[PDB]
Amino acid sequence: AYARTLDRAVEYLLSCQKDEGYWWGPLLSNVTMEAEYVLLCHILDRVDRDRMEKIRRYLLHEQREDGTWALYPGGPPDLDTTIEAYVALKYIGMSRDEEPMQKALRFIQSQGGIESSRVFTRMWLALVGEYPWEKVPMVPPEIMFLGKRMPLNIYEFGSWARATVVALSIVMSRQPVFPLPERARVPELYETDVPPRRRGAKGGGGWIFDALDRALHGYQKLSVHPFRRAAEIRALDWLLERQAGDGSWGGIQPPWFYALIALKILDMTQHPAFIKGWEGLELYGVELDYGGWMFQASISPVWDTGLAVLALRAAGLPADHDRLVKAGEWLLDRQITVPGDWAVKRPNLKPGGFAFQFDNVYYPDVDDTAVVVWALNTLRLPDERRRRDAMTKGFRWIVGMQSSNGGWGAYDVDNTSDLPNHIPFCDFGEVTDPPSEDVTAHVLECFGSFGYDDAWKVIRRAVEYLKREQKPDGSWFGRWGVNYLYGTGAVVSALKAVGIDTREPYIQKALDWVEQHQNPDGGWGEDCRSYEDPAYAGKGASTPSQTAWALMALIAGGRAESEAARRGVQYLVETQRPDGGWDEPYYTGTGFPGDFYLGYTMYRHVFPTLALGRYKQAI
Amino acid sequence: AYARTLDRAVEYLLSCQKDEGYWWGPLLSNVTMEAEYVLLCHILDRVDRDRMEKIRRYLLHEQREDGTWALYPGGPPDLDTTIEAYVALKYIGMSRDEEPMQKALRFIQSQGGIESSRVFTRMWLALVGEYPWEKVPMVPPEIMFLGKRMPLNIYEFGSWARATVVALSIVMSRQPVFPLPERARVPELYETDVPPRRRGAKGGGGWIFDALDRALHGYQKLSVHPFRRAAEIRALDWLLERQAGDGSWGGIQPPWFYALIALKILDMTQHPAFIKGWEGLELYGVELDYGGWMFQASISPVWDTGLAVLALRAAGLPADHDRLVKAGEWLLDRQITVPGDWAVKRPNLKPGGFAFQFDNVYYPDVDDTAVVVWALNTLRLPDERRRRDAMTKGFRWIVGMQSSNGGWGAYDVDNTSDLPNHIPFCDFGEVTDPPSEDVTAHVLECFGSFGYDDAWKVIRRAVEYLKREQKPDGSWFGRWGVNYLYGTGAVVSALKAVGIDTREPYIQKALDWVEQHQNPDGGWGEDCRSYEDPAYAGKGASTPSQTAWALMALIAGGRAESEAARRGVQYLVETQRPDGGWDEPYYTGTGFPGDFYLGYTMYRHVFPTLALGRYKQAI
Numbered sequence A, B: 001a002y003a004r005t006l007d008r009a010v011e012y013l014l015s016c017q018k019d020e021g022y023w024w025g026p027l028l029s030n031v032t033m034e035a036e037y038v039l040l041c042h043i044l045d046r047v048d049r050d051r052m053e054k055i056r057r058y059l060l061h062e063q064r065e066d067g068t069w070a071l072y073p074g075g076p077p078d079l080d081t082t083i084e085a086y087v088a089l090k091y092i093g094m095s096r097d098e099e100p101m102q103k104a105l106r107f108i109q110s111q112g113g114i115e116s117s118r119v120f121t122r123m124w125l126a127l128v129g130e131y132p133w134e135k136v137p138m139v140p141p142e143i144m145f146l147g148k149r150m151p152l153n154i155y156e157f158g159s160w161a162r163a164t165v166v167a168l169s170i171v172m173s174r175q176p177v178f179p180l181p182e183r184a185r186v187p188e189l190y191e192t193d194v195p196p197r198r199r200g201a202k203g204g205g206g207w208i209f210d211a212l213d214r215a216l217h218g219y220q221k222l223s224v225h226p227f228r229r230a231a232e233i234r235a236l237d238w239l240l241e242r243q244a245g246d247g248s249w250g251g252i253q254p255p256w257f258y259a260l261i262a263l264k265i266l267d268m269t270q271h272p273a274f275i276k277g278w279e280g281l282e283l284y285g286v287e288l289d290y291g292g293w294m295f296q297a298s299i300s301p302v303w304d305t306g307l308a309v310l311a312l313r314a315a316g317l318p319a320d321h322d323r324l325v326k327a328g329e330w331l332l333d334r335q336i337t338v339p340g341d342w343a344v345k346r347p348n349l350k351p352g353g354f355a356f357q358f359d360n361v362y363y364p365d366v367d368d369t370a371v372v373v374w375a376l377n378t379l380r381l382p383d384e385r386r387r388r389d390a391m392t393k394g395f396r397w398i399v400g401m402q403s404s405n406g407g408w409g410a411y412d413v414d415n416t417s418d419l420p421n422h423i424p425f426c427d428f429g430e431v432t433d434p435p436s437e438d439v440t441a442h443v444l445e446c447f448g449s450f451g452y453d454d455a456w457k458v459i460r461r462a463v464e465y466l467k468r469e470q471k472p473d474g475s476w477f478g479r480w481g482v483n484y485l486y487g488t489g490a491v492v493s494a495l496k497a498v499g500i501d502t503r504e505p506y507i508q509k510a511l512d513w514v515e516q517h518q519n520p521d522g523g524w525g526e527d528c529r530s531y532e533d534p535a536y537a538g539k540g541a542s543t544p545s546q547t548a549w550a551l552m553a554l555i556a557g558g559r560a561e562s563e564a565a566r567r568g569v570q571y572l573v574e575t576q577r578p579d580g581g582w583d584e585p586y587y588t589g590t591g592f593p594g595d596f597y598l599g600y601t602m603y604r605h606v607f608p609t610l611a612l613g614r615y616k617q618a619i
């Protein structure tokens, strides 16, 4: 029955594997990437007509009937996104008259205009001179002077925010303006009677920061700022030291772009770091078959490869399958062996983690590290020496990364400061990197493969963490994946692997929750709205991935031979394509709950296989 | 008569011009470049067997009958050079028995062995573990803390020494040892009864430094060095900021190599700066037709192009010659527009100088800047806007670079501290960059082209400088060229161009000196020994370049229609080759008086043409 499905799924995945032996599916986000890229090019004065064209087809293509753009497919119109896309188009050549421009423009106005956009959006517009810098939250270079153990020092922010802050401080220090030609000026973004509904700091704004900000903008106007030169250079050097190998910065769109702008400000366009940083961009671009061109918010080669293996293995392929060995060898050459920013909290910890992308040594994440090691642990590579050795390093690194609450974060340890969440500047996404349930889950699942059970203190401290975090309905929040189905699946799957008794009450209370949301079509689905409106928890169109997750939670809980269980399997078997793959017009990945969503291209193929592979195991 | 000579010389130069429109002749030095490269590769663990082979052919090729190597062709055996070449070969594969190894080894021993070599040589050997680090002059990272106006701060050293110091401080901070395989160990470098004749600090060693050094080596042994981490990082960042565009550092062999080693020490082999720095090396390498491979101490594209133009122009070609325009346009794209280390002394000075090599913005030198501007001033480019503009920037820069004595240095202003010359570490070449006669001369000649005469204060202050520096015999020392013929020519030529009366006494006393050294063969020549033994002043085998220089001094002094004058011309006319070029088996370029000599490949073709072009002008 399901066998034929698996056979097709397997041969498919194997056909997607690159020559080097790794898998790499594109990452989907929203048009702000491409939109901001257009502006960046204008800033750096490097506009390629032909590319602008490809970027135009894309933008329009992504626009919806109402003439707006959303964060995820089938999502509500987003002001910020739409504003940036609007400005982008108008710059490329669109006239404010054309239908697309008209519809989008009207949506923007009906929202209070530009004054309702996030800090970033207003900042970008500020950079081109379409918005006063004075009305933009201030971040001083001086911030570079705060010590390791001081309120608001760059190491209190999450890795993804840290770099951005350092880069921007230099930019805001100079508050540069790169004028747009008249044809692109967008004053119409102000023409609106609707009251501006401004967004506030994530965790709420304290009058202190509010004042402090007003203070900064004032000090900004003085004719002399003592030690600012030093402050700037401190930031520059900080960047110069951590530039990724591919020329990026952290392997993410934000800092990379701002870092390049900062260098342009400091007349360093002929310096190696900038050059390498510039041409590095192409690697993240993507030619679209319909003529468009998109820029990836980040790349997931390692991540994809890791899950790809675990899936193919759990599916059936030999632990020494010559094709899976290509992956094993590849993964071993990826392991990081040098101190990263995480070393600031664990100086006596030995490097051994892995990164999300290709070459990003200063920022290994616990998630990848766990999945990679675990994946390797299920293989038989020619050189048992390095396999044995590597796993050990990674293992020990993961352990030494465990936070105080027994949980695991993504990049840093106990990065749980609550101070940064109140700054005026931080009004978008997460700013700190505290421990999460899904990351912790994957870790336990990893150790589990080795055998380490509940007896070991480390495991228990974590389990306790998860138990305390479980939601009233017995569900688990999904941090880097949409959402409760994603989390619950991970946890249960983990707990099952660490020896815990699946018969437990809270465990059962979880499985029930799963079966309780199984859509009529047999599969499961959860819309990204489940981050905003609690009514969508476990609700949404069924997707290959989300179905596989809920399917794993069941197989782990012993209910593999159940109705809902066998039903969900049917879904996957049926909805499968002739080539063996699966389609997924929806996003199941999460960047920042309620603010940034991602589309993991491989998920629709990997998880369904992994789930089916495990179902075939329960029989 | 000479006409046919010129026509052939011109068409020849034009045939050497690259497509982009610039000239670029290889730069010759000594085997220490290649020898150290071999060690570097070993250090970075990147040895290419095939390359080692090419490097071996070269090394042997350069070895003389006695089995030694010298700094210049036809020069006395050099210990340092020979030692490094010996170690290099033995590493590549040579056995201490083979004839070449035998002769060289004996010479080394007859000199007191390794204990008689320069600091660098012992340091390199220290890096591979063939010499105790303790016996190597110490240079602490802490040096990075000295302020702009403090004794021995990095800005008291010459640009070429500065970078090296910063890079090395990190290396000496860790005192790493990269062991050589047994087959390469060179203990035999100690086996000698001869008393070790150690070289001392350039300007003599003060017991203070001697003590201070002993102190540093002691502090080096402590279990804790407060703020050293910071000191190191201060040095690293300093390097990361000034890395050249081609991946080098200053565009010279020394710092570049040490900088790469320093990065290797700091586990930064996967960092962009290191990668770019590594592959950048290839650009300086050179394939030799006989199988060998040499590495250039530096590259002279700009320098060559500049003189090439002035020669072709003074020769006859139209100021708008389509071929000379390729050069003009090219040169304009070279001008630097950002602050360099020179800005530390002239913060309110606007960038406008040029560099010696292709892409080296942080280190423009007065010499190139002068020759380039002047060269442009003799052309008619399509865009008189930028030609006019560029010249002005460069001109004003040169002016603002003039030192206190009215003379011009090479890279910095008043870089005349005498303190660094006494440090134990500085026992090789120049360490400071004070004003010189030849540089000042070229500058005056430059302004002269514009018309600025002795009336202008700047010119007078300089002329006074030259007058005070003139030697008893009315000759002028040659700093960056061998030697008195080189200097005298420059000065006289300059003074003539700035309006000065050539009939003056000191001027005449100079010309006489020239005619007085004309060899029998009609031409002039000066051996590099003229830096060590004053008996060689103006003495040596005749060379195309040196003849052209002395020939210019005469043409400028009005004695163009003289016997010696017409005689020297005959030499050039006769000694010319069928293709129109000229041969020059001797070095006429100077790096560091008595310690480092260079061979400028283009000199033998450019100067002879320029001189003949000017002779044809006197008629």
Ligand SMILES: C=CCN(C)Cc1ccc(-c2ccc(C(=O)c3ccc(Br)cc3)cc2)cc1
Binding pocket: A160, A161, A164, A252, A253, A254, A297, A298, A356, A365, A367, A368, A410, A428, A429, A480, A481, A591, A592, A596
């Ligand atoms: C399932 C595994 C997840 N795992 C932890 C890996 C991982 C880590 C981080 C990312 C990520 C990448 C880019 C962004 C932003 O665009 C962003 C936008 C705004 C700011 Br401010 C900063 C970054 C965000 C997140 C994606 C995947």
Ligand SMILES: C=CCN(C)Cc1ccc(-c2ccc(C(=O)c3ccc(Br)cc3)cc2)cc1
Binding pocket: B160, B161, B164, B252, B253, B254, B297, B298, B356, B365, B367, B368, B410, B428, B429, B480, B481, B591, B592, B596
């Ligand atoms: C005729 C015009 C000259 N003009 C000023 C240009 C110019 C400037 C500097 C060079 C030069 C290059 C490399 C070296 C060393 O090898 C060296 C060796 C030891 C140490 Br310590 C540092 C550098 C030396 C000098 C060559 C040419």
Ligand SMILES: CCCCCCCCOCCOCCOCCOCCO
Binding pocket: A241, A242, A339, A340, A341, A342, A343, A344, A362, B229, B232, B233, B236, B266, B268
């Ligand atoms: C340059 C001194 C080398 C000592 C560095 C080790 C510092 C410990 O890590 C602390 C965290 O800072 C992150 C460092 O890794 C980034 C690259 O900086 C270059 C050399 O480490």
Ligand SMILES: CCCCCCCCOCCOCCOCCOCCO
Binding pocket: A229, A232, A233, A266, A268, B241, B242, B339, B340, B341, B342, B343, B344, B362
């Ligand atoms: C960060 C300050 C930016 C202002 C630029 C003025 C820099 C003056 O340089 C002082 C001398 O140091 C030599 C410079 O070359 C180094 C490049 O530093 C890069 C940008 O500042």
